[PDB]
Design a protein around this ligand. Structure first.
Ligand SMILES: N[C@@H]1CN[C@H](CO)[C@@H](O)[C@@H]1O[C@H]1O[C@H](CO)[C@@H](O)[C@H](O)[C@@H]1O
Length: 350
């Protein structure tokens, strides 16, 4: 078929599975969230917590699906239909190494739901406690062993793909052990080989040797807020892509519809990026496509705390907070606008 509605398997949408309900999970997990103290704001801050009541959730926006559980198979079905509407073929699942049965259950449910709609799942390896290249290898082995034969497990040209958040927290000399073909604990040429996509943060003078010396296969930028880092400044993307191509690396720039996290980080207002009825998203997605990249990542499906979600949101005013909303756009606008941009991206790919 050539309908302009098919999923794109070089489009990765960052997905968070940490939401809970009292009924399914025992508490409205993540809808309730601690408020972060101001890192520049001095001692004796008791910033408190957002309680995750219907009236007061840990987001500046409000989900169409309400305070949902990420473990609810019926929510997962709806999310997969939203991925189909957006044409985003890969769900890039946050992974925190919780080592508990509720995590294991959720991951299986997500894979099962994804497969019904031909969506694929890859893992976004988060900065879990004591993360290092040895336990990363062990965890890559675990994830490929447990999930690699699931029909929804993503592969690109025969290889799994992982995104590694805050990969700069690990020295290149450690990464080399895992990612160089000669490394002491290499995954190269093993059953557990994968495309490893590290997080490009700061200037080229720092990031170019880091990526080369660490032996990453590519890099992504994550942040939805333009200008937050060098990497998340879209006017740098043409030159980042040029360097990537010259050095045999895969650049997967991250695009998002906006940013606002001031319910949970009230001191962080300088990072706010207004959605402007979709114009912000359009500008950022256009820059990614114009850079001539092979793959694009979307921050985010449902990072509700950071206001980067494309998941449907609805107007809501409670006694406790007046939420932002999609304004002159309908709740599914960011899904259907994603589909528009996926089409433009595909038109650009050979
Ligand atoms: N979701 C946050 C932004 N994205 C990165 C990569 O997925 C995450 O590590 C990051 O998580 C931190 O911030 C969340 C609140 O926005 C916390 O709930 C989470 O525990 C973590 O501190």
């Amino acid at each position: 078929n050539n309908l302009g509605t098919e999923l794109d398997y070089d489009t990765f949408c960052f997905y968070y599975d940490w939401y809970g309900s009292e009924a399914i999970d025992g508490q409205y997990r993540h809808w309730a969230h601690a408020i972060a103290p101001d890192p520049n704001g001095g001692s004796g801050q008791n910033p408190g917590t957002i309680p995750g009541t219907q009236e007061s959730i840990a987001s500046n926006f409000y989900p169409q699906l309400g305070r949902y559980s990420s473990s609810d198979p019926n929510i997962l079905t709806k999310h997969m239909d939203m991925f189909v509407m957006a044409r985003t073929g890969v769900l890039a699942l946050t992974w925190w190494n919780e080592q508990d049965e509720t995590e294991a259950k959720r991951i299986g449910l997500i894979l099962d739901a994804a497969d019904k709609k031909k969506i694929k799942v890859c893992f976004h390896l988060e900065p879990y406690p004591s993360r290092n290249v040895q336990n990363l290898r062990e965890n890559i082995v675990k994830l490929i062993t447990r999930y690699g034969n699931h029909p929804a497990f993503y592969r690109k040209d025969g290889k799994p793909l992982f995104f590694i958040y805050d990969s700069y927290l690990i020295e290149p000399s450690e990464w080399e052990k895992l990612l160089s073909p000669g490394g002491s604990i290499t995954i190269r040429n093993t059953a557990y080989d994968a495309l490893m996509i590290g997080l490009w943060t700061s200037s080229p003078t720092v990031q170019r040797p880091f990526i080369l010396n660490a032996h990453f296969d590519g890099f992504y930028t994550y942040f939805a807020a333009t200008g937050f880092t060098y990497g998340s400044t879209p006017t740098n993307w043409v030159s980042m892509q040029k360097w990537a191509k010259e050095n045999g690396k895969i650049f997967i720039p991250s695009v998002g519809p906006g940013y606002i996290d001031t319910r949970i980080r009230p001191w962080n207002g300088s990072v706010i990026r207004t959605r402007t009825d979709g114009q912000y998203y359009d500008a950022m997605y256009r820059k990614a496509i114009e850079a001539g990249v092979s793959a694009i990542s979307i921050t985010s499906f449902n990072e509700w705390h950071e206001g980067s979600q494309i998941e449907p949101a609805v107007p809501y005013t409670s006694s406790e907070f007046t939420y932002l909303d999609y304004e002159n756009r309908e709740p599914d606008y960011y899904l259907t606008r994603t589909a528009y941009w996926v089409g433009k991206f595909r038109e650009s790919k050979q």
